[PDB]
Amino acid sequence: HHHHHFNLPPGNYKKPKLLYCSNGGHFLRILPDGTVDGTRDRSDQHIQLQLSAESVGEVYIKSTETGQYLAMDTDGLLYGSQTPNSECLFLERLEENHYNTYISKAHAEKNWFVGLKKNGSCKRGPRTHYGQKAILFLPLPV
């Protein structure tokens, strides 16, 4: 179980989704240039994400618009990847019996989470921690 709990969020991956971060109320966004951030604008065409599971609890997060996969690099930075690889896998877990969190599988030991600051900028892996609102997401079916 990759040294982590296995409480999982309900639902399925059939329909693409919007990942709403309760921190600043932003939707996770993957820009065409590979940049990742969050925006409050629901009309944005880069927040529709298709999730799919490698194995139970392990997921890929893909922009339906550009086809890029969410990924975190060796230094904890999120980016849009043209090709699905090991940096594109995240351990999708329930948190506080309510939210969805996403731990980079490649850096699961250090608990590096996908997260958005209140200003809508992405947090760097090492700066995320259990207990922050930055790592809490609420998925919305498109």
| Nearest to 132, CA basis, from 101, 91, 87 | 101
Percent of the chain as helix, strand, coil, to the nearest 5: 10, 40, 55
Residue type, position 123, single letter: K
Residues 6 or more apart whose Cβ sits within 8 Å of residue 95: 7, 101, 130, 135, 136
Q: Which residue ranges make up the annotated binding site for heparin?
A: 23
Could you give the count of Cα atoms lying within 13 Å of 89 in the half-sphere of its Cβ? 14
Q: Show the domain range for 110.
A: 1-142
**Which phi and psi (to 5°) does residue 121 adopt?**
-90, 155
Contact between residue 43 and residue 29 where contact means Cβ atoms under 8 Å apart = no
* Integer Cα distance of 71 and 73 in angstroms: 7
**Which phi and psi (to 5°) does residue 71 adopt?**
-150, 160
Number of neighbouring beta carbons within 10 Å of residue 62: 22
Q: Which residue ranges make up the annotated binding site?
A: 23
**Domain count of the chain?**
1
The CATH number for 118's domain is 2.80.10.50
* Integer Cα distance of 112 and 89 in angstroms: 12
Experimental resolution (Å): 2.2
**Which phi and psi (to 5°) does residue 77 adopt?**
-90, 135
